[PDB]
Every structure is written in structure tokens, then in C-alpha cells.
Design a protein around this ligand. Sequence first.
Ligand SMILES: [Cl-]
Ligand SMILES: [Mn+2]
Ligand SMILES: [Mn+2]
Length: 480
Amino acid sequence: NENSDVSRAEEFKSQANEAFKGHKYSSAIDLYTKAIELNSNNAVYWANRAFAHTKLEEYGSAIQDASKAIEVDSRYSKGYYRRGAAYLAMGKFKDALKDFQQVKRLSPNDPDATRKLKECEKAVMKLKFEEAISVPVSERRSVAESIDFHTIEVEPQYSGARIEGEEVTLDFVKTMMEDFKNQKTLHKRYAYQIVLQTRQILLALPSLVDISVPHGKHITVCGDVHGQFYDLLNIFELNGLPSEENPYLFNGDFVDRGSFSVEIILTLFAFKCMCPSSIYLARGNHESKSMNKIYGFEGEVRSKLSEKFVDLFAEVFCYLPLAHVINGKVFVVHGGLFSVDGVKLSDIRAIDRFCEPPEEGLMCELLWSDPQPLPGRGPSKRGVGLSFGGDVTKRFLQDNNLDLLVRSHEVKDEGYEVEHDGKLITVFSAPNYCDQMGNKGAFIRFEAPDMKPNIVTFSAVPHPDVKPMAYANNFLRMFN
Ligand SMILES: [Cl-]
Ligand SMILES: [Mn+2]
Ligand SMILES: [Mn+2]
């Protein structure tokens, strides 16, 4: 059957490349799929759809597409290049080393092939040391055990904000945010005060927090912000600062990727210190030593804070709750649902969350999952977690007497998308993601008692000339 039309397939490829130039990666993937359907022996099509997949952080789909590209042409170096870029993007340095070994073997005198190979060799042995000294955080002394914040002297020439006494006050938070806005810094004493007080608050919280919004009051659910501090300031300017009267739920992924991650996490933690009922912080996948070590937050901390804040921030992130339930009706996780059925809220509440997210179990799945339009389950596009359909959402909701599922974790054009017949809503509060996506951000206000989700969208604001991934892993920087 010679029924493949190369002309129509090349028409789809150019259309997909045009959508690629315009950062319309989902449309590009669709057009590459149509191109592949009409011609599956062109490895360039597979490599391009893989490239578009990595742009959407769909690294599993990327690896699979690049693998089919390699299957088509053994000597197509761009297939191995794309697969290794996807592996490198998700931290699998050894697999990246394999694919970049192959990339050099094909083009043997190309300077960049040997360069990326020597780069990956340095990275894998560096990772060998890092992995050899890896110890579970629950078997380690807390940083709080060896640092009392009252002991830290503040030199009189420090011009930034000061916490007088034990209490974090709204006046200090406003001064801290204005200093952060002008690219100033907070003293180590007050950073330690904030983070150590936050450690106290979070460790006494269950893994699933029941949030009670009484009759007539409201709450704002926010999605990923990934270190875009100036868009966080925009959210607060458009919707009001966190307060007992105007509470916030931030659905994980506060840091990494964006280059103002320290300022966000210090602002969010301080608001929690000031009035705990004024803000609720769920955990994301990027509140993890695995992610922060390579995606910017850890390097941002080492630059603006010190090296002990790295372990302290990791420990505090391990204490973050995994989920929230608003008025016993609205279920808010970051990632999604699970590979098994019959999971009740009691199961989530009882999770021993004080560890780095494993590669298996309820914790990993609720932090990494994505919804799919078709019913059922399927392999994760990210290679971590799973894809769950509308039947999974509906069963979980009726099983738990819940009305709605709210989640984030995935970028959206308008900052939101309603799926699963109005039972799942993705919310994403990082507009113009990575300074290149061009999307709007969004947040959802919930007013009691009827709990109708009032979605509000917003656009990005300017910020100082600090490029994304600035403090991130060097090798991950020189791609995209
Ligand atoms: Cl993410
Ligand atoms: Mn996420
Ligand atoms: Mn995210």
C-alpha cells in the first residue's frame, strides 16, 4: 500500500513549523501527527514532534517520538539528540550521556557533538558524587537544630526590612515585598526567622488540609507561579493581599524555572507566618530536591541566601501538605489522581509525606499526573506519573462526596481549562511562562456557600532583565 502522500504531509510539516515559530506547541504537535499519519518513514517528522513535546515539558512523549525517529533512520543524529535533550531536561543524565555518545559517533569531527559529550561526562560523575552522599531527609538532623535565628547579628548598615520581635507583621511583609520588587535583599536573620517559623506551622498540618470558608466569605485558588515574582505582585494588586478576610491557596510549584523564586517563597512563607489562615501552600513537583537542584531554586538560594538554606528549604518543602479540600466540596491537588481506584480522603490525609516524592505511590501520582480527554488511564506524557480520564475524576469525586477537582501542573493558553465535563479545572498563574509562552495566567475565586468557581484571567507584567533559568543547571540552560 503506497498510500502515503508526501506533498500533503510536507504541507502539515510547514504548518507545524509555523506554529512552532509562534510557540503554539500543541497545534504543532497536532500538525506533526497529521504529517506523520500521511508519512511515517520521515524521521524529521518524529524528531520535530519530539522537539515540540519537550517544549511543553512532555518528556515521555518526547522520548517515545525520538525513539521512533531513531527506528526510522539509524544514522539520523538529530533523533538521538532530541531524545538526549528530553532525558537531560528531566534529569536523566546517564541516558542523556548514552544518546550524546551516539550523536558524536555519527558526526565524528563536529565540535558541538564532542562538546556536549564532554559536558554530559562531567555531569554524570558530578551526579555520581551527589547520589553517593544522598541521605533521606527524615534520617538527618534538621537545619533548625544547628541554627537559632536570634544568634544572627544584623550589621547596622543593613537597609532592608527588619522583623522586630518574634511576630511577622503586615508592615514587614509590605516592606519586604517592596524591597524584593526593587531587587533588594533580605537579611539572613529574617530569612531564617521566616523559614524556621514556617517549618513549625507546616509540620503540624495533615497531608490533606480541610479549608473552611464560612457563609459569605471567599478564597482564591492559584496555580503554578514558578518564581515569577512580579506576576505574583500583579495577582495581589488585582485581587488583594493575603489576609484572614482574603485568603489564598497556592497549588504548589512556587519556585524553579523562573528567576525570582527566592522572593516568591519568602513572600508566601512570610504571609503564612503572619496569619496562617491567610494563605495555604500545597506542594508541587518542583518543591523537591530532585527538581530544585537543576531547575533554578537551589542555585538561586546559593546566590542570594547561603548554602544551609538549601537543605532547610528542602526540609520545609517536605513538610508541605499534599492536598486541600475547600468546604468539603472542592478538591485541590497539584498534579491529579491515581492509578488505582477507591482512594478516599483519609488515605491522602494519612500519607507520610515527610520525604522526597518517590517514583511510586500516591504521593508521586498526585504530584505528577495529568488529565486526558478520553476515559480510562494511560501512560504519562511526562514519563512520570500517569494520565487519567474523566471517569477517574467522576468516580473519585462521587466516592468522596466532592463536587469539583481543581489542579495545576500544566500550562494553559488562557491560564485555565475546564475538562472532564466540568468536573476538573486546571488553573495556572504564571502568565507568559518562561518569558516565551505568551499565555495568560488565571486564578479562581470561590465564594461560599454555593462555591461557584469564578475564574479570573490576567496577563504578564514587566520585570527586570533576569532571564529564566538564570540560576538553573548550566547544561539545561544551553538547550530549548
Ligand atoms: Cl511542573
Ligand atoms: Mn507542576
Ligand atoms: Mn508547573
